Amino acid sequence: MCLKLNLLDHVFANPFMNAAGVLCSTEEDLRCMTASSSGALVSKSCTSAPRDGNPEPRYMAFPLGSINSMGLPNLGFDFYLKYASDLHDYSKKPLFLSISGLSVEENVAMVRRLAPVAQEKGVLLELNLSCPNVPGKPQVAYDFEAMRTYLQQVSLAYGLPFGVKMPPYFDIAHFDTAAAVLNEFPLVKFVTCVNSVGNGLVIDAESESVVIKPKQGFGGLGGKYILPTALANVNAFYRRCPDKLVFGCGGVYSGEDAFLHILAGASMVQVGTALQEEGPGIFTRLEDELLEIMARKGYRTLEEFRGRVKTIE
Amino acid sequence: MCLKLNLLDHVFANPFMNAAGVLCSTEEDLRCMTASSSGALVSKSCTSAPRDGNPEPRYMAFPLGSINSMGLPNLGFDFYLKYASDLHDYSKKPLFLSISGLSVEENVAMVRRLAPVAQEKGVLLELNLSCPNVPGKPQVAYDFEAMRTYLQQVSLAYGLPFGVKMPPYFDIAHFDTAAAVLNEFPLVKFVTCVNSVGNGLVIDAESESVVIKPKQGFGGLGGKYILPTALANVNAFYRRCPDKLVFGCGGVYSGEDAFLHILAGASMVQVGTALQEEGPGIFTRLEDELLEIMARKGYRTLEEFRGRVKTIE
Numbered sequence: 312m313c314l315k316l317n318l319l320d321h322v323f324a325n326p327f328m329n330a331a332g333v334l335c336s337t338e339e340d341l342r343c344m345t346a347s348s349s350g351a352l353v354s355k356s357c358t359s360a361p362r363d364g365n366p367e368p369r370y371m372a373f374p375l376g377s378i379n380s381m382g383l384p385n386l387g388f389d390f391y392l393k394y395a396s397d398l399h400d401y402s403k404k405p406l407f408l409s410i411s412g413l414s415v416e417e418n419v420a421m422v423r424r425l426a427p428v429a430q431e432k433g434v435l436l437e438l439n440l441s442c443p444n445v446p447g448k449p450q451v452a453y454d455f456e457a458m459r460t461y462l463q464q465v466s467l468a469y470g471l472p473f474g475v476k477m478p479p480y481f482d483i484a485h486f487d488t489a490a491a492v493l494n495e496f497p498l499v500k501f502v503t504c505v506n507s508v509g510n511g512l513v514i515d516a517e518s519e520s521v522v523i524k525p526k527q528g529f530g531g532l533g534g535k536y537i538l539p540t541a542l543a544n545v546n547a548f549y550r551r552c553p554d555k556l557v558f559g560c561g562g563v564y565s566g567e568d569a570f571l572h573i574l575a576g577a578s579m580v581q582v583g584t585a586l587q588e589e590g591p592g593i594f595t596r597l598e599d600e601l602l603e604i605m606a607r608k609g610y611r612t613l614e615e616f617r618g619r620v621k622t623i624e
Numbered sequence: 625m626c627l628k629l630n631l632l633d634h635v636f637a638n639p640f641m642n643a644a645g646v647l648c649s650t651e652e653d654l655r656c657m658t659a660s661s662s663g664a665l666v667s668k669s670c671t672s673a674p675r676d677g678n679p680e681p682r683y684m685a686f687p688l689g690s691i692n693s694m695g696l697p698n699l700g701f702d703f704y705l706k707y708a709s710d711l712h713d714y715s716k717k718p719l720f721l722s723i724s725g726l727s728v729e730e731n732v733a734m735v736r737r738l739a740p741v742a743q744e745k746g747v748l749l750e751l752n753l754s755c756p757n758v759p760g761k762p763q764v765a766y767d768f769e770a771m772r773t774y775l776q777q778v779s780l781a782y783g784l785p786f787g788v789k790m791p792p793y794f795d796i797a798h799f800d801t802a803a804a805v806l807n808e809f810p811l812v813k814f815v816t817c818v819n820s821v822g823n824g825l826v827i828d829a830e831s832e833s834v835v836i837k838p839k840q841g842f843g844g845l846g847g848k849y850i851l852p853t854a855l856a857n858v859n860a861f862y863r864r865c866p867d868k869l870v871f872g873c874g875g876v877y878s879g880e881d882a883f884l885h886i887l888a889g890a891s892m893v894q895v896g897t898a899l900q901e902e903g904p905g906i907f908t909r910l911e912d913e914l915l916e917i918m919a920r921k922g923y924r925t926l927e928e929f930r931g932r933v934k935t936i937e
């Protein structure tokens with residue numbers, strides 16, 4: 312029985328990795344993720360320039376999940392590029408670098424300089440499309456024409472296989488349109504579903520107050536709140552993009568939740584809120600729990616059940 | 625201390641009511657809701673002709689909430705109009721009639737017939753913008769020009785104050801665009817936030833199966849999964865639509881969750897999944913729990929705290 316995967320020309324000990332933004336901002340964080348039992352790691356979505364992010368408190372967690380308005384705090388592209396080129400130990404596990412430029416030109420600039428390091432060291436690009444474009448317009452992946460522009464420009468500039476991080480969608484027309492856009496780009500080899508569920512609002516009844524400072528308390532939701540939305544998006548894109556891999560993210564706290572992701576179609580399974588709350592020890596637990604479910608079911612590998620969710624009649 | 629309030633020229637014993645679709649399809653259901661301690665009731669969304677809806681199983685519930693692909697099963701508009709005109713006992717509580725025609729013309733036809741009954745009996749209209757998916761077409765509330773058409777046409781045909789049931793939004797640009805659409809229509813006097821979160825997917829790990837039959841398991845989510853989404857939509861519309869009322873719906877299981885909706889801006893508070901699971905006895909519990917929280921805080925009225933959620937700094 313085994314959790315091994317071979318994808319994107321890399322070998323992974325198991326499907327588990329951090330979700331971008333969690334335990335991945337500093338050198339310390341990346342070294343921690345590397346020392347963990349995860350099968351891979353991704354860096355914090357970066358910008359060309361370092362950012363302090365939004366005012367605190369900007370993340371909070373609760374029994375059913377988390378809310379955040381971090382504001383893209385990061386050490387800047389040059390730091391994450393240096394990590395990928397000079398610091399990461401590729402013999403331990405694969406590295407993904409996530410980018411979230413504030414314009415198409417900023418993304419193009421970064422990917423042009425990442426390309427040679429991708430080619431030589433094997434760092435994998437995850438392009439975050441669930442992020443700001445022009446304020447007062449929807450986020451990029453909710454603006455299909457912007458999305459298409461970003462993917463055309465990054466594909467030309469980078470020239471290598473990459474993946475995309477998508478926000479969740481809630482309407483079948485949007486699943487159809489989004490996937491049609493992604494299927495125009497043969498270099499998009501993976502799709503990570505999902506980023507946080509946008510603009511939720513947590514209110515504390517005792518204090519009668521929102522719990523995070525930025526944006527009048529509004530922020531992206533993660534955790535147990537989002538698991539059925541995550542699974543839906545994984546399966547929707549799995550069905551619509553047969554030539555691409557799908558990575559699942561959202562609501563994973565247990566090997567059972569991971570098994571559901573994988574049944575929906577996930578290759579890799581990313582862990583955000585629960586990793587933020589439990590710490591990197593979570594990965595041994597998730598591995599053990601998933602292997603227990605596989606043993607009970609008689610499955611020896613992940614491919615025996617990936618995407619094999621049953622429908623009724 | 626009592627929870628009675630006046631809205632839309634009607635008196636309500638308390639702010640609680642069923643969510644459309646739950647305990648409100650048949651005469652039996654409507655009589656049960658009328659006998660309950662709820663402050664009001666709403667009928668199942670109707671179409672001009674009766675519909676059987678989708679194949680079973682089409683609703684399932686779990687500790688954290690529910691999923692449904694009912695398919696708009698209903699007894700047809702003639703039935704609900706007859707209930708409003710001849711059977712409902714208005715001395716017991718106000719009645720809302722929910723309509724979900726599959727085209728603008730169907731909605732127009734229904735509202736022209738409802739108008740005199742509204743004038744004579746005081747039945748209130750809730751116009752449901754959600755309907756079964758049509759390939760190639762977004763849901764009406766996610767297509768702002770379609771929304772504008774529907775509301776223009778309904779406003780003209782109906783001529784009286786009405787409300788609109790909205791799906792959730794997840795992007796601040798969309799809140800701004802949607803509210804600006806709604807604010808073009810002075811007869812839209814209330815907005816209900818929110819319908820179920822669209823196109824979630826619940827998978828059973830033992831059976832490796834989806835749990836509802838229609839639409840390959842995809843359905844709308846309700847319950848605990850959706851409370852932060854609901855609160856965000858209530859507050860975003862409360863802030864943007866100062867001349868309207870907002871009715872909260874989503875995730876209410878307790879008087880604390882009601883309290884949160886009201887702090888966010890809700891005038892009435894609708895109960896879906898929790899009502900479906902607990903039954904109509906839930907209304908006495910919610911009323912007792914909300915009065916207790918008020919008493920512990922020193923609030924004597926709903927008005928003292930409605931919309932008064934505190935932000936940080």
Ligand SMILES: Cc1cc2nc3c(=O)[nH]c(=O)nc-3n(C[C@H](O)[C@H](O)[C@H](O)COP(=O)(O)O)c2cc1C
Pocket residue numbers: 330331332333355356370377379381383409439476505506507532533534535537560561562563581582583584585587
């Ligand atoms: C504190 C925090 C920071 C995040 N920052 C990023 C980010 O930089 N890039 C990104 O693609 N997603 C980011 N996300 C989203 C997560 O990658 C993930 O998509 C989301 O939290 C849902 O997964 P979960 O339910 O396991 O939390 C962040 C999430 C959290 C909680």
Ligand SMILES: Cc1cc2nc3c(=O)[nH]c(=O)nc-3n(C[C@H](O)[C@H](O)[C@H](O)COP(=O)(O)O)c2cc1C
Pocket residue numbers: 643644645646668669683690692694696722752789818819820845846847848850873874875876894895896897898900
């Ligand atoms: C079985 C079921 C049927 C529903 N049918 C309708 C409907 O006919 N009209 C409508 O506006 N909403 C309908 N809804 C949505 C609910 O009114 C409500 O917006 C949603 O379930 C979220 O509230 P909750 O978290 O309390 O369940 C239905 C929900 C359920 C569970």
Ligand SMILES: COc1cc(CCc2c(C(=O)O)[nH]c(=O)[nH]c2=O)cc(OC)c1
Pocket residue numbers: 332356365379380381382383384411439441442443450506507531
């Ligand atoms: C408040 O700051 C942000 C930041 C981003 C990009 C980074 C990001 C963040 C974050 O840095 O806040 N949080 C997420 O849950 N996911 C993300 O992808 C998107 C975003 O909305 C699209 C708002």
Ligand SMILES: COc1cc(CCc2c(C(=O)O)[nH]c(=O)[nH]c2=O)cc(OC)c1
Pocket residue numbers: 645669692693694695696697724752754755756757819820822844
């Ligand atoms: C599968 O059938 C439907 C039905 C409707 C309208 C009635 C309705 C239903 C329902 O009858 O399925 N369920 C909801 O949660 N909300 C609703 O508004 C919307 C709808 O949105 C996709 C799908």
